[PDB]
């Protein structure tokens, strides 16, 4: 009976490939040649944030584009004012092995998680003035690798147990569980309309999930090795994935197939972080070679390098207004770039 | 601009208080040594954990053990709440002082798996600086298995037949030559990978530990002291 299912899956995959080939009548690189290139881009580090003892593993900007939360493996969750460099808050974490941190869109809460398999949510704006843990979401059986807030009450967290989960924070229970991945889910991205989200996993595949239904809307493949960074295009119709095979790929949700590939011969180091510019014209990717590269996401020509970090560039983010880019590395320093 | 000045003053005062707290936390973060405990289920890494607990706790997957030797703090983390695909979370332990690697040397069937895990750890891009304290647990079981026969190690390692015990060995007084040859063969099997890559930036520290062994804390202390001594000696423009 297993052979019949294998043959059915093979013919379904063949149909998928044939439909994609039929729809792939052109490439993004063909007709974008006439587009004027973005040109060489230099953006010096406007600020340097230095208060972290150990390597920075994640960060997240605030929706006001001024405050930003960062996580370090020493066990701290410093909130920085990117303008005045002052540390607004410094949350000591129960477990120092944290791989992710999130900033609520309202700004009232900050989430974090990691090797403890627990998503801890801290109420920033308490009545007493001190930051205390407001919730401890448990139920993931692997390390937590990404956290993103839908709102003050709903949070989507990806884990190393090959599953994503949407939690109702008020009750603290898994509202829904997205189980389609084969490897560890390394990063997720909420859509601008927050009705869908893409998760890239350690199975060299990304998946589009719809939040309400809880089903795998779409599946995208093409990466040789495992994906460890992902983010939507500003319109939510596309996303980008950085992988350990030292390449980024831009997929489009509607076309259901890979659109662009960003890679170079001298780049043999895996991408650690990926984000888009405000317009999506620029794709900023932090690599293992201690550098961050800026890609013309429409032409796939490397236009800009954010050199200046002494260790692996673990985390990377761009503000909602696009004014600044914060890159954090394993040398325990964040850098605000513009 | 009175409101702006007051806001800036309050922000600076909060930043100063937080920075003082951060200095206080830094004075203790550098005063402790992080240790990553690795091994298979059969290896008595939990046994070592309990033995140095007699000399701290964990229930969220990670088991944390805090111990002190000569007023020096060691924090050891046994990551036991994940899946067996460790190629991703292990990169968290790049700044760890040392990786304790516990090997069940009694059973030869899983010894090649332990050797391959050691190879991956030693040759990892983010772990090629970390030194490994190799504990070869269950030496009494290995002695009994070797002396009892009917459990030939040559079946799993053909090159054992063309192997003689090293001249610079330190066998126990009441120890059979055969078990000395076997255990030093296992140690040299691990040292073959150890002394094949990573030129001088990290070293392996093999140890022969039984089920009960109260010197494990002192051995870790001495090996970490040697690791830090080598790090200091490398500060003189060496690399």
């Amino acid at each position, epitope marked *: 009976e297993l052979d019949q299912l294998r043959q059915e899956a093979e013919q379904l995959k063949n149909q998928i490939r044939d439909a994609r080939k039929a729809c792939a009548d052109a490439t993004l690189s063909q007709i974008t040649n006439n587009i004027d290139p973005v040109g060489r881009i230099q953006m010096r580090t406007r600020r340097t944030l230095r208060g972290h003892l150990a390597k920075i593993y994640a960060m997240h900007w605030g929706t006001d584009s001024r405050l930003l939360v960062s996580a370090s493996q020493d066990g701290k969750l410093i909130i920085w004012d990117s303008y005045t460099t002052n540390k607004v808050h410094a949350i000591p974490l129960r477990s120092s092995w944290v791989m992710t941190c999130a900033y609520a869109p309202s700004g009232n809460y900050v989430a974090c998680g990691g090797l403890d398999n627990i998503c801890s949510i801290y109420n920033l704006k308490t009545r007493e003035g001190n930051v205390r843990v407001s919730r401890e979401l448990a139920g993931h059986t692997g390390y937590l690798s990404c956290c993103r807030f839908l709102d003050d009450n709903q949070i989507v967290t990806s884990s190393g147990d090959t599953t994503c989960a949407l939690w109702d924070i008020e009750t603290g229970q898994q509202t829904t569980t997205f189980t389609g991945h084969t490897g560890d889910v390394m990063s997720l991205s909420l859509a601008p309309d927050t009705r869908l989200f893409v998760s890239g996993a350690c199975d060299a595949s990304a998946k589009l999930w719809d939040v309400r239904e809880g089903m795998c809307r779409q599946t995208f493949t093409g990466h040789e090795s495992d994906i460890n960074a992902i983010c939507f295009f500003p319109n939510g119709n596309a996303f980008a994935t950085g992988s350990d095979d030292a390449t980024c790929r831009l997929f489009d949700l509607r076309a259901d197939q890979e659109l662009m590939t960003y890679s170079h011969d001298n780049i043999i180091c895996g991408i650690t972080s990926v984000s888009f510019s405000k317009s999506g014209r620029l794709l900023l990717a932090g690599y293992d070679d201690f550098n961050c590269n800026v890609w013309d996401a429409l032409k796939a020509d490397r236009a800009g390098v954010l050199a200046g970090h002494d260790n692996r560039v673990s985390c990377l983010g761009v503000t909602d207004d696009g004014m600044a880019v914060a890159t954090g590395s394993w040398d325990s320093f964040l850098k605000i770039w513009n | 601009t009175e409101d702006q000045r007051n806001e800036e003053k309050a922000q600076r005062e909060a930043n100063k208080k937080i920075e003082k707290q951060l200095q206080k936390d830094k004075q203790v973060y550098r005063a402790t040594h992080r240790l990553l405990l690795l091994g298979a289920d059969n290896s008595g890494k939990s046994t070592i954990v309990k033995q140095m607990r007699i000399l701290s706790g964990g229930t969220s997957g990670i088991f944390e053990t805090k111990f002190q030797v000569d007023k020096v703090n060691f924090h050891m983390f046994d990551v036991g709440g994940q899946r067996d695909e460790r*190629r991703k979370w292990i990169q968290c332990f790049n700044d760890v002082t040392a990786i304790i690697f516990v090997v069940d040397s009694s059973d030869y069937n899983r010894l090649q798996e332990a050797l391959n895990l050691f190879k991956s750890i030693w040759n990892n891009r983010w772990l090629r600086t970390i030194s490994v304290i190799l504990f070869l647990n269950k030496q009494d079981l290995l002695a009994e298995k070797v002396l009892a026969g009917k459990s030939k190690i040559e079946d799993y390692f053909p090159e054992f037949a063309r192997y003689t015990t090293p001249e610079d060995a330190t066998p126990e007084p009441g120890e059979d030559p055969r078990v000395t040859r076997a255990k030093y063969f296992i140690r040299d099997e691990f040292l073959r990978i150890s002394t094949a890559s990573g030129d001088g930036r990290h070293y392996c520290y093999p140890h022969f530990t039984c089920a009960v062994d109260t010197e494990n804390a002192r051995r870790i202390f001495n090996d970490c002291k040697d690791i830090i001594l080598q790090m200091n000696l490398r500060e003189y423009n060496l690399v």
Partner: nanobody
Amino acid sequence: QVQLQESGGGLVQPGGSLRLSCAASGFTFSNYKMNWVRQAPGKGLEWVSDISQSGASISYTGSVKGRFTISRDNAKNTLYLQMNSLKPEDTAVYYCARCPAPFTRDCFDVTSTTYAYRGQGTQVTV
């Protein structure tokens, strides 16, 4: 997408010979170290042998050191394991495993939680 399709093997006499082949698609065969692992009934996956990116650091487990010979063809993107003097202990299912990342000397491929870059397998009964 990456795919490792195994072929060869089956029913062989206790002492005969076989050759397992592994066709790789979706990735550059040259940049990855390849492995042969196997899973016999009653026990979990075990690593049989591996070969480096070019084919200069061939290594084997001790039980197959003198018999099995692993060899890769980058032009054909294929991985072969030539088995001879087969014993009944080789009655496992043989999987062609691929190391997770290119240009690396470290591999974690024996995992029983469905390692992604591992083939479907071939039954080799002796």
